[PDB]
C-alpha cells in the first residue's frame, strides 16, 4: 500500500464512505477509532509521562509495545495537557511531532490549542491564529524527519470556536499548508449537540472534500450518526471504555445501566449485537458480576461497548454504500431514543 | 457417562493421576478447580446472599447462569460464613444441601465446621464431632432429593485440626456414612506449610484410597506439588485470581510483582507459559497497563495465572503418568525457589 491514500466509494447527501490505505493497513470510513477496529488511538500525554517516548522507542515503538501491527493514531497532547507562543510547560509543535515519531504512530496530529468554550470572538480568533502558526511548525517538523515523512501521515486541526468566519480562516490556513487529513477541533467541549451540529453544518464543507474529516472526541452513538450526516469520516471517544467501567452499556434501544435492579433477572443478552459477550451471557449475569465487583464484568461490558460501536460504524458504512443512510439514521433515532 | 466414577490410571509413591467421570464431563486428576479447567467452583455464600439460591434456580441454575456446561463444585458455605447444633445464624446441613441443589452444582460439599487454628484437643474434638453429625445430616438431605441423588455427587469433609487421633476418628465416621469423595478440611488456616504437610502425611492415608481426596483452600504452587506427593487429587484456591488483581504473576521462576520498576523495560513474556497472554504481550506492557490502572492489565494477569495453574496441573499429571513425578517435584522446587 501507499503511505496515504483516501478514496471515496459512495456518497449520500454530505455523507461519505470509503477507505484510507496506509502501509500498515486499510481503514474503512466512517471509522470509529477506539483507545488502544482498523486503527486505534495511543495516549500521547500519558505515554510521554510514563514510560516516556524515548523508552517506548527503546522498546520498539508503540506497535510492538502494545502488540498492534495495524495503524495507530496519536493526538498531539495539548488537549490533554490543557503557555507562550513557543508551546506549553507543565510541549511544542516540534517536541510533539518528535514524541509522536518516537512512538511510531501512523497518523500524527498537529500540535494545536483546543479553545475553551465559551469563547469570545477575539479570544477564539487569537487562539485559532496561534494554532495555525503551530500547524505550520508541525508540518515543518514532520517533514524534517525522513522516516516520518515517508511512512506516516499528518492531519491539521481546524479551530475557531463556534464562529463561521474563524472556521473559514482556519480551514484556509490549513489548506494552504497542506495536510493528509483535516480534523475538526474545538468541539465536544460542552457546547451541546445542537450547537455542535450547527457548527459542523458550515465547518465541514470548508475542508477539502477529497481528504478525510476527523471529528475529535465525538462521541455518543447519536452524535456520530449526526456527524456522518454532516460529512465526518473519523471518530474517537473514550465513552465506550469509560462507560464499560461504570456500568453503562450501549444498545440499539439506548444505553442501559446494567447495575440497576431491573436487570437482575433479565436473561436477554446486553443487546441484535453479534459480539462474543452477547453470544454467551445474559444481562442478569453481567449485572451480577458488576455488582460483585468482578473484573470480568467490567471486561465483558467494555468488550460489548467496543463491539457495539464497530457494529454501528459497519451499519453506517453499509447504508451509505447502499444509498439508504438517510433511512437508517431516522430508524436508528426512532429506536435509540 | 455415569453419575460419578473415579478411576486411577497411574501412581508414583502416594501420588495418583486419573479421572473422575460425571454426567457433565470428565475431570482429570490431580485437578485445580478455579473460581467460576475441567470443573469450576461456584460461590455458595455469595450466591445465597445475591441474588439468592431461589433466584438462581429461577434463572435456570448456575450452569446456564454463568454459561458453563461442565461440572461445578460448590462449598457448603460455613467456612465463608464463619451457632448451635442446628447450624448457624448470621445455614444448616439441610439448608446448605438445599441451596446447593437450587444452584444445580455437580459436586456438593457436606456442611461442616472449619475448626479454628490453633485449637486445643478438646475443642478440636468437640468441633469434629459436630461436623461428623452434620455430615450424616448432609448425606440424608442429599439422598432425599431425587434429582440431586441421581445426578450429583456428595463429598464429606475430614476435620480434627492437627491431631492424628481426631483425624482418624473423623475419617472412620465419614467412611461409615459413605461419600463419593473425601475432602481434607481444617487446613490452610494459618498453620504454615510444614505443619500442613505433617498433618497430610498421616491424614490422607486414612481416607478411602479408591475415592478422590480434595484439599480445600490449597494453595500456592509449591503447596499443591507437596500435597499431590501426599495423595491429594483436587485443589481450589482464590490465589490465582486475587494475585491477578494485585500485581502478582506466577512463573516457573517464582512469583513476580509486575508493578515493580524492574519490569518496565522487560520484553520477555510473563513466563515457557503457553498462555495467550504470554503468546502476545511483554512484562513491560502489562506492567504499564497495571500501573495505569487499566482493567485489561488485571485481566491479562488473571488469565495468565489461571493458565499457569492449569499448566502446572498438566505437568503433574503427565509426570505421574510417566513415572517421573519425583524428579519433576525436585526440579520444580529447584527453579521456583
Ligand atoms: C471530548 N471532546 C474532545 N476531545 C478533544 C480532543 C482529544 C481527542 N481525543 C484524544 C484521546 C482522548 C483519550 C486519551 C487518548 C487521546 C482534541 N484534541 C486536539 N488535539 N484538539 C482538539 O481541538 C480536541 C478537541 C476535543 N474535544
Ligand atoms: C484458604 N484455606 C481454606 N479454605 C477452606 C475452605 C473453603 C474452600 N474454598 C471455598 C471457595 C473459596 C472462594 C469463594 C468460593 C468458595 C473450607 N471449606 C470447608 N467447607 N471446610 C473447610 O475445612 C475449609 C477449610 C479451608 N481452608
Ligand atoms: Zn454485545
Ligand atoms: Zn502466560
From Swiss-Prot, chains A, B:
Q: Where does Zn(2+) bind?
A: 273, 275, 278, 304
* Secretion signal span: none
Which InterPro entries does the record associate with it?
A: ArchSynthase1/Queuine_TRR, TGT, TGT-like_sf, tRNA_ribo_trans-like
Record's keyword terms, sorted: Glycosyltransferase, Metal-binding, Queuosine biosynthesis, Transferase, tRNA processing, Zinc
Q: Which Gene3D superfamilies match?
A: Queuine tRNA-ribosyltransferase-like (3.20.20.105)
Per the record, the GO terms for biological process are:
queuosine biosynthetic process; tRNA wobble guanine modification; tRNA-guanine transglycosylation
Q: Which cofactor does it need?
A: Zn(2+)
Positions binding substrate in this chain are 75-79, 112, 159, 186
What EC number(s) are associated with this protein in UniProt? 2.4.2.29
Q: Which superkingdom heads the taxonomic lineage of this protein's source?
A: Bacteria
- Which of the seven top EC classes does this enzyme belong to? transferase
Which Pfam families does the record match to this protein? TGT (PF01702)
Q: Which reaction does it catalyse?
A: 7-aminomethyl-7-carbaguanine + guanosine(34) in tRNA = 7-aminomethyl-7-carbaguanosine(34) in tRNA + guanine
Family membership: Belongs to the queuine tRNA-ribosyltransferase family.
Function of the protein: Catalyzes the base-exchange of a guanine (G) residue with the queuine precursor 7-aminomethyl-7-deazaguanine (PreQ1) at position 34 (anticodon wobble position) in tRNAs with GU(N) anticodons (tRNA-Asp, -Asn, -His and -Tyr). Catalysis occurs through a double-displacement mechanism. The nucleophile active site attacks the C1' of nucleotide 34 to detach the guanine base from the RNA, forming a covalent enzyme-RNA intermediate. The proton acceptor active site deprotonates the incoming PreQ1, allowing a nucleophilic attack on the C1' of the ribose to form the product.
Q: What is this protein called?
A: Queuine tRNA-ribosyltransferase
Amino acid at each position: 500500500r501507499p503511505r496515504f491514500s483516501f478514496s471515496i466509494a459512495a456518497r449520500e447527501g454530505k455523507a461519505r464512505t470509503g477507505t484510507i490505505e496506509m502501509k500498515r493497513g486499510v481503514i474503512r470510513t466512517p471509522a470509529f477509532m477506539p483507545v488502544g477496529a482498523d486503527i486505534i488511538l495511543g495516549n500521547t500525554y500519558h505515554l510521554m509521562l510514563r514510560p516516556g517516548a524515548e523508552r517506548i522507542a527503546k522498546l520498539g515503538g508503540l506497535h510492538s509495545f502494545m502488540g498492534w501491527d495495524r495503524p495507530i493514531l496519536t493526538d498531539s497532547g495539548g488537549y490533554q495537557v490543557m503557555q507562550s507562543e513557543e508551546g506549553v510547560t507543565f510541549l511544542s509543535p516540534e517536541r510533539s511531532i518528535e514524541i509522536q515519531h518516537l512512538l511510531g504512530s501512523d497518523i500524527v496530529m498537529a500540535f494545536d490549542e483546543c479553545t475553551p468554550y465559551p469563547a469570545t470572538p477575539s479570544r477564539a480568533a487569537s487562539s485559532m491564529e496561534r494554532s495555525m502558526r503551530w500547524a505550520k511548525r508541525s508540518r515543518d517538523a514532520f517533514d524534517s524527519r525522513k522516516e516520518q515523512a515517508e511512512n506516516a501521515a499528518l492531519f491539521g486541526i481546524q479551530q475557531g470556536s463556534v464562529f463561521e468566519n474563524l472556521r473559514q480562516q482556519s480551514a484556509d490556513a490549513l489548506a494552504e499548508i497542506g495536510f493528509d487529513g483535516y480534523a475538526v477541533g474545538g468541539l465536544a467541549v460542552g457546547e451541546g449537540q445542537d450547537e455542535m451540529f450547527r457548527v459542523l453544518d458550515f465547518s465541514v464543507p470548508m475542508l477539502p472534500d477529497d481528504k478525510p474529516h476527523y471529528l475529535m472526541g465525538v462521541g455518543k452513538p447519536d452524535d456520530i450518526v449526526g456527524a456522518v450526516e454532516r460529512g465526518i469520516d473519523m471518530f474517537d471517544c473514550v465513552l465506550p471504555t469509560r462507560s464499560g467501567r461504570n456500568g453503562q452499556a450501549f444498545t440499539w434501544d439506548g444505553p442501559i445501566n446494567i447495575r440497576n435492579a431491573r436487570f437482575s433477572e433479565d436473561l436477554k443478552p446486553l443487546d441484535e449485537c453479534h459480539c462474543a459477550v452477547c453470544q454467551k451471557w445474559s444481562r442478569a449475569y453481567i449485572h451480577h458480576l458488576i455488582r460483585a465487583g468482578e473484573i470480568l464484568g467490567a471486561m465483558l461490558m467494555t468488550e460489548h461497548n467496543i463491539a457495539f460501536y464497530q457494529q454501528l460504524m459497519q451499519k453506517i458504512r453499509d447504508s451509505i454504500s447502499e444509498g439508504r443512510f438517510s433511512q437508517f439514521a431516522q430508524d436508528f433515532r426512532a429506536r435509540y431514543f
